[PDB]
């Protein structure tokens, strides 16, 4: 029940914003507050040609 990283810093009021490659999911969205996404992402599988 302890957060680390950008989410950890934001939770403990050590950082107002966390700008970066942050993936939105349920736990993060319920522990902190997110904004409208600006770029599409998600789980993807990549292999050698």
């Amino acid at each position: 029940n302890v957060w680390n990283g950008m989410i950890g810093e934001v939770v403990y009021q050590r950082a107002v914003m966390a700008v970066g490659s942050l993936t939105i999911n349920e736990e993060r969205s319920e522990v902190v507050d997110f904004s409208v996404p600006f770029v599409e992402t998600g789980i993807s599988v990549m292999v050698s040609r």
């Binding site: 999911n25 349920e26 969205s29 996404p37 599409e40």
Partner: protein
């Protein structure tokens, strides 16, 4: 052939192109956005609605919805009529 081009959302036109053989999209999506469940500015439901939508996206429920309602193709795509001339000859 009454309208040369129709500008519209990617999902709807892609579904129509999948359903209709004579209709095709071009690709190169521009103005990327997302369909949302809009509601009043001061509504207590919104906070839980966002979490529920994200939870549904987390598991395969939304993938199942895409499979059932959106992701199915009827027709996607020399021939006899091309060499019909030499047969005519």
């Amino acid at each position: 052939n009454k309208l040369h081009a129709f500008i519209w959302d990617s999902a709807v036109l892609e579904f129509e192109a999948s359903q209709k053989c004579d209709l095709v999209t071009t690709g190169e999506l521009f103005f990327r956005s997302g369909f949302g469940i809009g509601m009043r500015k001061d509504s207590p439901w919104k906070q839980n609605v966002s979490l529920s939508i994200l939870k549904s996206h987390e598991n395969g429920f939304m993938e199942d919805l895409d499979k059932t309602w959106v992701r199915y193709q009827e027709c996607d795509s020399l021939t006899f009529e091309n060499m019909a001339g030499v047969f005519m000859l």
